[PDB]
Every structure is written in structure tokens, then in C-alpha cells.
């Protein structure tokens, strides 16, 4: 499909207000890609918009 879905294996916890809180076992739709540095992104979860390290997540091949 057009956008990519990624499962997050290493869940974090509410770090900041400008940061998106994601827990393990949830899917977040990638709104827009990050610049050069591979490790940051943005997605919407629970009606929020915030950035999170994508390292803590893996790409699902299918």
C-alpha cells in the first residue's frame, strides 16, 4: 500500500507533551517521513501527534 505500517516491539512511556505516546501492541499510521537521520518519525495515536524513535520498532516485511 501507499503508507507503511510498523509494529513497535519496544514500547516507551509518555516522555513529553510534544511527543506521541505509544505502547506495544498498537499500530500507528505514518503521517510523514523524517529528514536524513534514520531514527525519528511522526504518527498519530490516541488522537495525538508526536515524534518517536523508530528504532524501537521493526519493519514488517509483508
Amino acid at each position: 500500500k501507499s503508507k507503511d505500517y510498523c509494529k513497535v516491539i519496544f514500547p516507551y512511556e509518555a516522555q513529553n507533551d510534544d511527543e506521541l505516546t505509544i505502547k506495544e501492541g498498537d499500530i500507528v499510521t505514518l503521517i510523514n517521513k523524517d529528514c536524513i537521520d534514520v531514527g525519528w518519525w511522526e504518527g498519530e495515536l490516541n488522537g495525538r501527534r508526536g515524534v518517536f524513535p523508530d528504532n524501537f520498532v521493526k519493519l514488517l516485511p509483508p
Binding site: 519496544f10 514500547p11 516507551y12 510534544d18 531514527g39
Partner: protein, 76 residues
């Protein structure tokens, strides 16, 4: 047992530790190697934020286990 810490680009860091080592001590070893102050480092394993008053065995961390860490461009 050896543990691994990944940075922004996923860098691999090998450390020598003892099961009796404290998390604060582990952070200190990372500071020595990478120059990152302990107050700017949050350790996470098994999906749960690791606490400074708990041990590695409490989180069922086994030999060759790898943790996940962030850099610090906005809020770590």
C-alpha cells in the same frame, strides 16, 4: 553477560557488567564511552521502563540481551 545499547542510528555498544551492577553504574560506563550524561539517558527493556532500584534479573534479561535507547534531538 554482555548487553547492547543502540543510539539514533542504531550503533552497537558492548559493555562488561556483573549481575550485581546497578543501572546507575551501567549509565556511568556509557558516559565514559559515549560522553552522554546519565541524566539524559532513559533505559528500556522488555517494554517496561527500567527503574534504578531494580535488578537485571527482575526484568528477565538474559545473556546477549540488547536494550533500546534514543539520542536527544528534541526530548530523547
Amino acid at each position: 553477560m554482555q548487553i547492547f545499547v543502540k543510539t539514533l542510528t542504531g550503533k552497537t555498544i558492548t559493555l562488561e557488567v556483573e549481575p550485581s551492577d546497578t543501572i546507575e553504574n551501567v549509565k556511568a560506563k556509557i558516559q565514559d564511552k559515549e560522553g552522554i550524561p546519565p541524566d539524559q539517558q532513559r533505559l528500556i527493556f522488555a517494554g517496561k521502563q527500567l527503574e534504578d532500584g531494580r535488578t537485571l534479573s527482575d526484568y528477565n534479561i538474559q545473556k546477549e540481551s540488547t536494550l533500546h535507547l534514543v539520542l536527544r534531538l528534541r526530548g530523547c
